[PDB]
Design a protein around this ligand. Structure first.
Ligand SMILES: [Mg+2]
Ligand SMILES: [Zn+2]
Ligand SMILES: [Zn+2]
Ligand SMILES: [Zn+2]
Lengths: 114, 264, 141, 158, 86, 133, 43, 65, 559, 160, 196
RNA sequence: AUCGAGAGGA
């Protein structure tokens, strides 16, 4: 009855942007990005790959409510470093890892005979 | 051999594949498992219209069961979401229409299987919507039993969906995840009355990892990079395609984030 | 035949009963610690023996599993809750026109049953589902 | 010695010790005359009624007697310097804070004490659930309704 | 009964705004805001009547007088500005 | 910007206080016997075996948001095999010309009584503890 | 259905309390909770 | 009323198994659990779907209308 | 009684309630459906006019919308069925009945209205699913639980009424309770056990977990605390992460049992300026008790800060508890073998003592204490024997139970359970009592037909040697059923009697209000107390302070 | 009974004292007995205390018994709330039951009485009375629907 | 609710991935709070978990008949033979993170019953609506679109706070407001008013 | 509209 429609978990809406970026108040070089229509799956990986990088000081993902599908990623980086750049570098590294693993597992399956 | 994560497969079959993930962070492993369970798309029945029903089962029960029935979804890439198509309700390229009619002619109970199911719309060269049957006899998954004098006639429209919307679009049944077989990293603290080793069963995966030795200090630096996993197939998509599609869908989500960042 | 008799509440005051038939077997060590401590009956001249202790409780209580290990008020609460529990009342449900009826999609017979439950028709006509239940703290909901 | 009373002077003292970062080596700058006369001034500064007639003044003094006793116990001239280290600034700040907290603590006119008291006695009675002396809700019945006859009359001879 | 009054000097009523008069004055001021009556404080990013009333209370500019009543019949009047809020 | 106190101690006793990763250590000062300590320590990250004598120092520095260890181009504050950050809760005097210092490192507790120093470990929040082999 | 078909009702110095004589005749604890708790029993 | 399609936690298909399982325990005098293991169900959460299910469908069929 | 004093009222709601940890204590989880039906009348002003017009454009079916409009003449305009709903132009002074919107005041009530704490007003938060939602810490004043309980909600209709609810009936104000002079709300259930588990010195958080937990705090500044451990890894203490939530300038001291400043047991608490020095958090520090942190923060800073603190503590602790895990199990109720054997030997010793007392009773040698029947003395002595035996076996078991035991940790936090629960589960459930007596000879000289006549013994009188885990015998089962029936009838009768008593008390004390001259008087003018409470002060601002002059000798007094 | 009493040095120390308990109360003769302390004797029945020692002593004993009831459960209520009820009973003549017998028969307004038990009899007797309800009572104003003289409506708000 | 007196109501519904998972991948359909158990002392709930797991593995039925001599240690021995922890505790992994949970978690098969209290059937809201003729007050019940009752107890609880105007609007304007003409010389409402 | 019955909560 009162339940939200299931497609609202993975579908964007009107007037909704996938990423919204707002600087942190009383914080230097810090910004919170509101990922919308996305969940834990993206956030934990993004935060971990940010944590691997040295230049970024702070990286955290918060889920505002289990009801809705959104999460906030706060990133704070070195002076002279765009936090968006750090996010992009982490994303590209993730993608490279994914492709490498996909090709390696494909060759492994071709080796497999059953 | 490519720089980065390495995979070695223990055993293979059409249903299950067991493999050892190597040189990875754990966050992407659990994220990939989430994507595999939910995110990767599948074709399944999303609409049913019942012209005639005389079965003791009510129509809603049947619609739920039909939504659960497994259908082939390997060529789902050529198929497009019914919401992304330009059709009014259902296009041949966006939906697959399948009709079922059965009469209990036999005085003995006439059961109904997933095999007894016809396809109406054009396949258009695709391998989509074939009702998958793993039964040794070849008969489908049982749906109903019809007494003599009973018939059931209905039409189903099957569309693409994500397991997030409904569990029917689910590509895998059981996922097996393990690490720290020796619990050297001590990520969990065992509960014991007398002794943890005697009370807690030893895992199989323990064999492949080097045993720990008492008298060695706890390794602070060590972080989990070796993982053991096993993947099962509902059969709607083969196992290898299921996992590689999980990888690809996760990459696509990352790429869409990147695209939105570029747009801003 | 006289091997069994009907006992009124008045007549009970003249008779002496043993819970277990094995009480009448001659008495004579080692015993497993977990098994329940039962009093050596220390009494003779038993007139009768009870059919089985599980008969003293009623129909709703016979559904409750291991009620001997649970608190009695909670057994009462469950005995009240089975009436509100949903189930398939009879197979003629589809034919009958009741003012209100409710029926489970996939009824399942309990994995652990009382023996008396056999004569209660619960395994044949169950009213619950056997769910994988975890006791843990997750997200505090 | 433990009893319910307003203002919680101990917490104010701890707040003063942390806030001003008082250092134990230095001696106090407090005047003895000022300490005692300021305690007396603070006693004069706490009010519950403001009428200018003798019976109301006496009522105010007797109504704040116990709190004044606590004030004198908490602010002793030996204790103010020896037990904890204090400065004139912190002493005056504590005096004003005690005054303000006591003034805030006074009942606002218009509050229905009767309904609140009735609820506050009723609620734990609902919680009561379970020796030759009556106890519990039946005892409360005996107390509440004038009982010409008691179920457990008794007396204690000393 | 006749010309019941209390002289302003030496009044013993508490010089504090008890929760009830603050609440009633805030509610009446919010009612005034919702009625589109003139407002005598400058507003900065405010639309709600209640927060406007709170700010007016802080500025101590509300032309109302709380009438304290004594059981004998004599009444005391205390203007908002004379009254204080802790 | 320098050390407040330095000494070498020997552990009289190690006590597992119902903790699996933390033990309370009791240590006596070598040379002068007027001073000694007892500190809660994490034995899992540094084994504190009995009959082992350990070096102890306390430093004021080397607020500001914490930053990683970074490349290590910044010099170590100490090559010592243990370091903690903490704040002192109470300074006490056991006897005339004899002082006692009570410190707490995020819940761990240190107690060190000695007489020799009276110009160090003042009532300020900042403090660091370094412990070599 | 069964439990309703097998029901007792007692209209009205200690009735509600489970009696020793109730052993085996009446179920010990299958009773409603409410204003008529204990007066109504099950066989 | 009728055999579950899939386990609510496993998600593994169990509709095709049911008939075989029954036949297996009658023709070979099989233990229920040995039949379950032979059927390929190694997880107890999908095993519950088979072991405790009761085919209420058969009784409804007996009703002539 | 029914149509004049208390009435069915308009703008009412009621649903089943569930608990949402990520929901502020003052907020209430109003479902969307009720927000659509319930309306607040509003008058158009230049400040709100835009939004109001937009509201009516959204229509009554989608919220935020408006259901009705009122013209100056008063002829209603229905948004649901009217052709003008699209082209309306609203002039000033007209009324719009807007839908219930977020950050609005509404009364929230539980059906037993035994407290003014039961009728406090909450802020509105609109939520998708159907259940009324609320904070775990607001359950205590209501006594509500999520077993299907239903609660009610009321919507004010005028600005002044909203002000009364916001400034008199706000939840943060009712935190300090006029009865018992202690806060009535506190950290409860999962949050309490999690806070205990986190504050342990054994448990240390790591950098990644620390960063996530730090971000979870809403008003967090962004300064990263210095790590507690620095050499092998940058570890953190749970006490530091929790101190991130404690407001600056807050000091608390707590000494109990043996509390050295060294504090080897880590009992007691020292908190300075929002940082926690030593101790492990449990119910006394974090709960509703006097001197609890809620009391200190409410008195020192203000109530809104305290409610925000509720929220912060819950968020951080629930996150960490999710990542640590918790459970219960049969293994938590299983006692060690030799401990069970010693418990059984204790029971056997008690049985022998009872037997020897009965043997003395048979020989007519026992003396009669003044004012007590011989049988009375015998019964009381045997009862004391059995009670002490049960308690001693329970203490033995509890000593055997390790600190890793989950039920032990739940009792240590104070979340749920007591010593008696453990003792009944693992050692012995006790001796049954009916009408303040041992099990009665319902049959002729026999408590049960299976027992012999004229048998005064622990088993005939119903002492259950077995525990809940061990398994009760049938006779013990029936006796326990008798006792439980007495408990249930006690509830069923005491509820009615106490409701009647509360009603009479309330009807007697309606007119007791402190007048301006500070006397408490009725409507007629009669004075009850010239100064309420004899000190003229509100019971919230009253705390237990020790008077040092009373205790102690004259010599220490002088020194 | 264990007891706390000042030692000659000054500190409070424990003192064991023998004290006896009765099963029935006949107070007037009991106190006039040698070997007892009239200042220290106590009784359960507060009505006899009121008859013998006056109304204030019975007030204190009533508070003590209510306090014992509250503390038997372990609960605690601030002394003001219970003292309010004890004073309400004590302030007018003898002890007044919280029942239609005692506290409804008071001179309060008739509608505040009719809200409690025996509504119609109160209404009839009062109609024969022609007594004038002051309309001060909160129940009276609740019946009238007008804003009662609660703290919010206790003052009249006027302009400058 | 369960067969051991443990009642409950859903707070949240999570998807399968968000739930914690065992090594085998088994996801609990149902999660209940441990803190409830100690106060209730329903040990048979835990025993049912254990015996149901053992029976599911055995392919044989489990006997939960009362007063039958069965040992928890024996059932644990069986489960141990089947390669699981004797008490039944199972290692579990956090769903959101994939990290091991420090506390091993008890989860097993348990009979659970749906109850005749749905949220949707209970929920109701009034706003303005129908009024009974005799009292000019809201009709009773959700089905009649009626209004909730503001009890005299609730009235007292509101009097304690002191919101007199709120009570006036609740008990005059909300339910049964009325305007009446009265005559002083009468003292009663005998006046007839030609208002037009 | 009466009256009855059953159930929900501490
Ligand atoms: Mg409940
Ligand atoms: Zn299409
Ligand atoms: Zn399964
Ligand atoms: Zn007239």
């Amino acid at each position: 009855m009162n339940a939200p429609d299931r497609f609202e978990l993975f579908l964007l809406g009107e007037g909704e942007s996938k990423l919204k970026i707002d600087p942190d108040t009383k914080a230097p070089n810090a910004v919170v990005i509101t990922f919308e229509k996305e969940d834990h799956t993206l956030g934990n990986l993004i935060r971990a790959e940010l944590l691997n990088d040295r230049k970024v000081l702070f990286a955290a993902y918060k889920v505002e409510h289990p009801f809705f599908a959104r999460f906030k990623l706060r990133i704070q980086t070195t002076e002279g470093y765009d936090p968006k750049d750090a996010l992009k570098n982490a994303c590209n590294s993730i993608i490279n890892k994914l492709g490498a693993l996909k090709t390696n597992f494909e060759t492994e399956w071709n080796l497999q005979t059953l | 051999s490519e720089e980065g994560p390495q995979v070695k497969i223990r055993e293979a079959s059409k249903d299950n594949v067991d493999f050892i993930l190597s040189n990875v962070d754990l966050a992407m492993a659990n994220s990939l498992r989430r994507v595999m369970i939910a995110e990767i798309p599948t074709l399944a029945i999303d609409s049913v219209e019942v012209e005639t029903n005389t079965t003791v089962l009510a129509d809603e029960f049947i619609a739920h069961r039909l939504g659960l029935i497994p259908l082939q979804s390997m060529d789902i890439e050529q198929l497009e979401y019914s919401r992304d198509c330009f059709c009014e309700d259902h296009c041949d390229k966006c939906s697959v229409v399948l009709t079922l009619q059965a009469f209990g002619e036999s005085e003995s109970t006439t059961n109904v299987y997933s095999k007894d199911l016809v396809i109406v719309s054009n396949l258009m060269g695709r391998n989509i919507g074939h009702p998958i049957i793993q039964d040794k006899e070849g008969n489908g998954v049982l749906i109903c039993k019809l007494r003599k004098g009973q018939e059931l006639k209905l039409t189903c429209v099957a569309k693409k969906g994500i397991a997030k919307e409904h569990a029917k679009w689910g590509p895998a049944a059981a996922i097996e995840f393990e690490y720290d077989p020796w619990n050297k990293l001590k990520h969990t603290d065992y509960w014991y009355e007398q002794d943890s080793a005697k009370e807690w069963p030893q895992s199989k995966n323990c064999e492949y990892e080097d045993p720990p030795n008492e008298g060695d200090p706890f390794d602070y630096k060590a972080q989990a990079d070796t993982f053991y996993m096993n993947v099962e197939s509902v059969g709607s998509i083969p196992v290898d395609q299921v996992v590689v599609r999980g990888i690809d869908t996760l990459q696509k989500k990352v790429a869409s984030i990147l695209l939105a960042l570029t747009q801003m | 035949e006289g091997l069994v008799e009907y006992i009124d509440a008045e007549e009970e005051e003249s008779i002496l009963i043993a819970m277990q038939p094995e009480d009448l077997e001659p008495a004579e060590l080692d015993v497993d610690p977990a098994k329940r401590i039962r009093v050596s009956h220390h009494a003779t001249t038993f007139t009768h023996c009870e059919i089985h202790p599980s008969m003293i409780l009623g129909v709703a209580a016979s559904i409750i599993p291991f009620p001997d290990h649970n608190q009695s008020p909670r057994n009462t609460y469950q005995s009240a809750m089975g009436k509100q529990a949903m189930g398939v009342f009879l197979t003629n449900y589809n034919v009958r026109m009741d003012t209100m009826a409710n029926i489970l999609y996939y009824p399942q017979k309990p994995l652990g049953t009382t023996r008396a439950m056999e004569y209660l028709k619960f395994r044949e006509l169950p009213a619950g589902q056997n769910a994988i239940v975890a006791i843990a703290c997750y997200s505090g909901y | 010695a433990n009893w319910p009373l307003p203002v919680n002077i101990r917490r104010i003292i701890q707040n003063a010790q942390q806030t001003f970062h008082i250092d134990h080596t230095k001696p106090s700058d407090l005047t003895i005359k000022d300490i005692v006369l300021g305690v007396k001034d603070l006693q004069e500064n706490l009010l519950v009624l403001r009428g200018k007639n003798e019976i109301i003044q006496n009522a105010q003094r007797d109504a704040v007697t116990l709190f004044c006793c606590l004030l004198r116990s908490r602010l002793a001239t030996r204790r103010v310097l020896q037990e904890y280290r204090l400065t004139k600034q912190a002493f005056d700040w504590v005096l004003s804070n005690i005054e303000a907290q006591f003034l805030r603590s006074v009942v606002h006119p218009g509050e229905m004490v009767g309904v609140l008291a009735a609820q506050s006695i009723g609620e734990p009675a609902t919680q009561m659930t379970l020796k030759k002396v009556t106890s519990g809700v039946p005892r409360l019945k005996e107390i509440l309704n004038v009982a010409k006859n008691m179920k457990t009359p008794s007396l204690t001879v000393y | 009964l006749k010309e019941k009054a209390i002289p302003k000097d030496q009044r013993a009523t508490t010089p504090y705004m008890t929760k009830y008069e603050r609440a009633r004055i805030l509610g009446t001021r919010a009612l005034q805001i919702s009625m589109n009556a003139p407002v005598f404080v400058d507003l900065e990013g405010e639309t709600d009547p209640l927060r406007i009333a709170m700010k007016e209370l802080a500025e101590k500019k509300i032309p109302l007088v709380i009438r304290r009543y004594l059981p004998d019949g004599s009444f005391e009047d205390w203007s908002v500005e004379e009254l204080i809020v802790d | 910007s320098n050390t407040l106190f330095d000494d070498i101690f020997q552990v009289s006793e190690v006590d597992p206080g119902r903790y699996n990763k933390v033990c309370r250590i009791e240590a006596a000062s070598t040379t002068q016997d007027q001073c000694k300590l007892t500190l809660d320590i994490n034995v899992e990250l540094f084994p504190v075996a009995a009959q082992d004598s350990l070096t102890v120092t306390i430093a004021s520095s080397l607020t500001r948001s914490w930053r990683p260890p970074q490349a290590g181009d910044r010099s170590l504050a100490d090559d010592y095999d243990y370091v903690m950050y903490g704040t002192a809760y109470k300074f006490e005097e056991v006897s005339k010309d004899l002082i006692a210092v009570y410190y707490s490192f995020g819940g761990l507790l240190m107690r060190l009584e000695g007489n020799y120093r009276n110009l160090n470990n003042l009532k300020q929040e900042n403090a660091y503890l370094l412990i070599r082999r | 259905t069964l439990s309703h078909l097998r029901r007792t009702n007692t209209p009205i110095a200690k009735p509600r309390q489970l009696h020793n004589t109730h052993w085996g005749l009446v179920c010990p604890a299958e009773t409603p909770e409410g204003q008529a708790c204990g007066l109504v029993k099950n066989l | 009323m009728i055999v579950p399609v899939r386990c609510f936690s496993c998600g593994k298909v169990v509709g095709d198994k049911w008939e075989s399982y029954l036949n297996l325990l009658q023709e070979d005098e099989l233990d229920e659990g040995t039949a379950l293991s032979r059927l390929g169900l190694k997880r107890y959460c999908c095993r519950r779907m088979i072991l405790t299910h009761v085919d209420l469908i058969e009784k409804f069929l007996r009703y002539n209308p | 009684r029914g149509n004049l004093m208390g009435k069915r009222v308009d703008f009412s709601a009621r649903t089943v309630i569930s608990g949402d940890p990520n929901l502020e204590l003052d907020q209430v989880g109003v479902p969307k459906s009720i927000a659509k039906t319930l309306t607040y009348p509003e008058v158009v002003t230049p400040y709100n006019i835009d939004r109001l017009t937009q509201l009516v454009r959204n229509g009554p079916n989608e919220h935020p919308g408006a259901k009705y409009v009122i013209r100056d003449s008063g002829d209603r305009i229905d948004l649901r069925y009217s052709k003008r709903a699209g082209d309306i132009q609203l002039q000033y002074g007209w009324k719009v009945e807007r839908h219930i919107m977020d950050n609005d005041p509404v009364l929230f009530n539980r059906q037993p209205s035994l407290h003014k704490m039961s009728m406090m007003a909450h802020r509105v938060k609109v939520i998708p699913y159907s259940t009324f939602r609320l904070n775990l810490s607001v359950t205590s004043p209501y006594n509500a639980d999520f077993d299907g309980d239903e609660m009610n909600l009321h919507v004010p209709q005028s600005e002044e009424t909203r002000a009364e609810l916001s400034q008199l009936c706000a939840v943060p104000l009712q935190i300090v309770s006029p009865q018992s002079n202690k806060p009535c709300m506190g950290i409860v259930q999962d949050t309490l056990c999690g806070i205990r588990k986190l504050t342990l010195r054994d448990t240390f958080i790591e950098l990644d977990q620390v960063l996530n937990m730090l971000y979870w705090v809403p008003d967090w500044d962004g300064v990263i605390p210095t790590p507690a451990i620095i050499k092998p890894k940058p570890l953190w203490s749970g006490k530091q992460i929790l101190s991130v939530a404690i407001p600056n300038g807050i000091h608390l001291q707590r000494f109990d049992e043996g509390t050295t400043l060294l504090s080897p047991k880590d009992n007691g608490m020292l908190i300075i300026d929002g940082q926690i020095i030593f101790g492990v958090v449990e119910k006394k520090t974090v709960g509703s008790s006097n001197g609890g942190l809620i009391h200190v923060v409410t008195r020192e800073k203000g109530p809104q800060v305290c409610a925000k603190l509720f929220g912060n503590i819950q968020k951080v602790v629930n996150f960490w508890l999710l990542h640590n895990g918790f459970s219960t199990g049969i293994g938590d109720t299983i006692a060690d073998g030799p401990t069970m054997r010693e418990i059984t030997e204790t029971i056997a010793e008690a049985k022998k003592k009872v037997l020897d007392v009965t043997k003395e009773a048979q020989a007519n040698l026992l003396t009669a204490k003044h004012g007590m029947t011989l049988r009375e003395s015998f019964e009381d002595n045997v009862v004391r024997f059995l009670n002490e035996a049960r308690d001693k076996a329970g203490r033995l078991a509890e000593v055997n139970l390790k600190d890793l035991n989950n039920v032990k940790q739940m009792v240590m936090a104070g979340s749920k359970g007591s010593f008696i629960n453990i003792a009944q589960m693992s050692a012995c459930v006790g001796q049954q009592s009916v009408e303040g007596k041992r099990i009665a000879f319902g049959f002729v000289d026999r408590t049960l037909p299976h027992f012999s006549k004229d048998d005064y013994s622990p088993e005939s009188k119903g002492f259950v040697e077995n525990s809940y885990l061990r398994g009760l015998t049938p006779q013990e089962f029936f006796f326990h059923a008798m006792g439980g029936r007495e408990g249930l009838i006690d509830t069923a009768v005491k509820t009615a009697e106490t409701g009647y008593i509360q009603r009479r008390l309330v009807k007697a004390l309606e007119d007791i209000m402190v007048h301006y001259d500070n006397t408490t008087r009725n409507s007629l003018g009669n004075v009850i107390q010239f100064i309420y409470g004899e000190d003229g002060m509100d019971a919230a601002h009253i705390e237990k302070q020790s008077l040092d002059t009373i205790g102690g000798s004259d010599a220490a007094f002088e020194k | 009974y264990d007891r706390k009493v000042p030692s000659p040095t000054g500190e409070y120390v424990k003192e064991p004292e023998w004290v006896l308990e009765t099963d029935g109360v006949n107070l007037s003769e009991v106190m006039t007995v040698p070997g007892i302390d009239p200042t220290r004797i106590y009784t359960n029945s507060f009505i006899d205390i009121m008859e013998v020692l006056g109304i204030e002593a019975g007030r204190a004993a009533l508070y003590k018994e209510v306090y014992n009831v509250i503390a038997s459960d372990g609960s605690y209520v601030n002394y003001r709330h219970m003292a309010l009820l004890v004073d309400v009973m004590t302030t007018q003549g003898g002890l007044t039951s919280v029942t239609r017998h005692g506290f409804n028969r008071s001179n309060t307004g008739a509608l505040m009485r009719c809200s409690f038990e025996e509504t119609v009899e109160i209404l009839f007797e009062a109609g024969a009375s022609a007594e004038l309800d002051d309309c001060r009572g909160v129940s009276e104003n609740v019946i009238l629907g007008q804003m009662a003289p609660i703290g919010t409506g206790a003052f009249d708000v006027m302009i400058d | 609710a369960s067969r051991h007196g443990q009642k409950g109501t859903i707070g949240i519904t999570y998807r399968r991935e968000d739930m914690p998972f065992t090594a085998e991948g088994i996801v609990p359909d149902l999660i209940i709070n441990p803190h409830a158990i100690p106060s209730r002392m329903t040990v048979a709930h835990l025993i049912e978990c254990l015996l149901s797991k053992v029976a599911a593995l055995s392919g044989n039925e489990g006997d939960a008949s009362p007063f039958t001599d069965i040992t928890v240690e024996g059932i644990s021995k069986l489960l141990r033979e089947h390669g699981y922890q004797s008490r039944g505790f199972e290692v579990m992994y956090n769903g959101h993170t994939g990290k091991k949970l420090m506390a091993q978690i008890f989860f097993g098969p348990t009979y659970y019953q749906r109850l005749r209290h749905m949220v949707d059937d209970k929920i109701h809201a009034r706003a303005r609506g129908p009024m009974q003729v005799l009292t000019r007050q809201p009709v009773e019940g959700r089905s009649r679109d009626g209004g909730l009752r503001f009890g005299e107890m609730e009235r007292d609880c509101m009097i304690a706070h002191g919101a007199a105007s709120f009570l006036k609007e609740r008990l005059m304007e909300a339910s049964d407001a009325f305007r009446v003409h009265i005559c002083g010389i009468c003292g009663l409402m005998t006046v007839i008013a030609k208002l037009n």
